[PDB]
Amino acid sequence: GAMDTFVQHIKRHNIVLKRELGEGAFGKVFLAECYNLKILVAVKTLKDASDNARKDFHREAELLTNLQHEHIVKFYGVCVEGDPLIMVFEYMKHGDLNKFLRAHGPDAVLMAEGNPPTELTQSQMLHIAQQIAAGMVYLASQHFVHRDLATRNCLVGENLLVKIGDFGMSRDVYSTDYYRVGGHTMLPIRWMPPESIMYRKFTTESDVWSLGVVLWEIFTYGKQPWYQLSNNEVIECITQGRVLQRPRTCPQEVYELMLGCWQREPHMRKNIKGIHTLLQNLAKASPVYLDILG
Numbered sequence: 001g002a003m004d005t006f007v008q009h010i011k012r013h014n015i016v017l018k019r020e021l022g023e024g025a026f027g028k029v030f031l032a033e034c035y036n037l038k039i040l041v042a043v044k045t046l047k048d049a050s051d052n053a054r055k056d057f058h059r060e061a062e063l064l065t066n067l068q069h070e071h072i073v074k075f076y077g078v079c080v081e082g083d084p085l086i087m088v089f090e091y092m093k094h095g096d097l098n099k100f101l102r103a104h105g106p107d108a109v110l111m112a113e114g115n116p117p118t119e120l121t122q123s124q125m126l127h128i129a130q131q132i133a134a135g136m137v138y139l140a141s142q143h144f145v146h147r148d149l150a151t152r153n154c155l156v157g158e159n160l161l162v163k164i165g166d167f168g169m170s171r172d173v174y175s176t177d178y179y180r181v182g183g184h185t186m187l188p189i190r191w192m193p194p195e196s197i198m199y200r201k202f203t204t205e206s207d208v209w210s211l212g213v214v215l216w217e218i219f220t221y222g223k224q225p226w227y228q229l230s231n232n233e234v235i236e237c238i239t240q241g242r243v244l245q246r247p248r249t250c251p252q253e254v255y256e257l258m259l260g261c262w263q264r265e266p267h268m269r270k271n272i273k274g275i276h277t278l279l280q281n282l283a284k285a286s287p288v289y290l291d292i293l294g
């Protein structure tokens, strides 16, 4: 609504930092407790920054305050009373989707020492996929371009609820999923289309390509896209027109949906609304009802 345009400010007393979650692109990310909003939250910090860096922090808060949807990680507001500056987000119960997918994969089931996890079902994969596509419909409606859509950037809550966020990790500290394109910028090439790699053009359509890769991650239980390849080999495949293989178990319509995300020409890719409609329909016809363990 119109009120979400205005950033909510939070009192410093109401935030208690607990532990570091990882190094972010502009500062440390912490698990914290938040009172009068106790609940667990994740906070992004900005320590002893310049005037321009603090200006950018408020501009990012003004962007996020207005992105509020059922399938978008909740932004609660900021605290700029002291140093560091703090951005507050919800801390989801079941962590990141990439870890979740791997924890429910055939290998995790086979290697479990005690009580095994349940292998993620096709119905559960469809349910996760439709929620991510729903969040992407919302972000496109807001003219927001994500640029780093991947399962590691999705979070899982209770009742297999899934939301899209962006941890915004330091790409220099954690370089596994990033490549220094042109020797200049760290970018997530394995999830990117040819125009984003070659011309650094990011749009709703390059996010659609990434969504296709996220569907591939879901149906492969969180495997790294193009895991058989070096970064330079990945770039050669993407720019030449080779595609990720069909997951062992995937509805054929779902693999064809992925292929539709991977059209070389951005304007010829499947439209986000259509992707969401198809996944929503498949998920409703194969609902989630089995218990999920481990």
Ligand SMILES: COc1ccc(COc2ccc(Cc3cnc(N)nc3N)cc2OC)cc1
Residues within 6 Å of the ligand: 021, 029, 041, 042, 043, 064, 067, 072, 073, 074, 075, 089, 090, 091, 092, 093, 094, 095, 096, 144, 152, 153, 154, 155, 164, 165, 166, 167
């Ligand atoms: C564009 O809309 C956006 C909405 C939210 C965000 C912030 O995203 C995040 C902010 C913090 C975290 C950290 C985090 C880790 N584990 C769990 N369990 N919950 C968390 N919170 C993860 C995030 O995304 C995966 C970025 C963009």
